[PDB]
Design a protein. Structure first.
Length: 208
């Protein structure tokens, strides 16, 4: 059973801006998603200090980058804290409205799209390179869900029947036809070295 939701108008506007603005420095999407993974790994690690059973769903704290040229997908996998259904349907859009407003204001004031992460909404930079984004996520307090959006003002949420993850988040980028450079080992290595060299978790770039 698939549920379809409308984005808040401000988030739909942000997604249209990211899709429509001419901006060549698209590679920053990967820094933003890796940063989000690192933050989610920090969260589960710190929570585990007070409740060690929170790692019963998996002790390993890592980030995997998985290109697939057959499917034309780049997947950013982490074993961080994950997201609840309530996050996916309500909490994320509610909290992000203020960051989105501040970001779009900053852009009019001359700021650059690369500053998007300072406003808490760097996830949406995925749409610089992806025509569709699928997020598979598992939080200790909830079931495994699949969120998906091709923009256009709506997203879907369903329970995920795929391979159980234990805990964490997979961001699956269905790349635009002209953005397949982000499936190349040499290109991903270059971007991780440039923007993500000090992330405090192992980043494994899978190869094909
Ligand atoms: N790998 C990851 N693992 C776990 N959780 C993650 C995450 N990746 C993201 S980002 C993501 C993923 C989405 C999505 C929207 C967004 I955004 O829809 C579909 O998938 N999250 C959510 C973040 C976590 C940090 C808090 N944050 C909300 C917030 C709190 C306080 C202030 C502000 S704010 O005032 O600064 F706007 C924002 C949402
Ligand atoms: K992939
Ligand atoms: Na900060």
């Amino acid at each position: 059973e698939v549920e379809t939701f409308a984005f808040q108008a401000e988030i739909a506007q942000l997604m249209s801006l990211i899709i429509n603005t001419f901006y060549s420095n698209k590679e920053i999407f990967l820094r933003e998603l890796i940063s989000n993974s690192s933050d989610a790994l920090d969260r589960i690690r710190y929570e585990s200090l007070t409740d060690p059973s929170k790692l019963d769903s998996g002790k390993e704290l890592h980030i995997n980058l998985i290109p697939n040229k057959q499917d034309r997908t780049l997947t950013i996998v982490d074993t961080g804290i994950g997201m609840t259904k309530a996050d996916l349907i309500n909490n994320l859009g509610t909290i992000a409205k203020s960051g989105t407003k501040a970001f779009m204001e900053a852009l009019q004031a001359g700021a650059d799209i690369s500053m998007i992460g300072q406003f808490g909404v760097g996830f949406y930079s995925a749409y610089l390179v992806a025509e569709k984004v699928t997020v598979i996520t598992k939080h200790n307090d909830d079931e495994q869900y699949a969120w998906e959006s091709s923009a256009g003002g709506s997203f879907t949420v369903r329970t995920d029947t795929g391979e159980p993850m234990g805990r964490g988040t997979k961001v699956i980028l269905h790349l635009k036809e002209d953005q397949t450079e982000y499936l190349e080992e040499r290109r991903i290595k270059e971007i991780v070295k440039k923007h993500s060299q000090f992330i405090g978790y192992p980043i494994t770039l899978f190869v094909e």
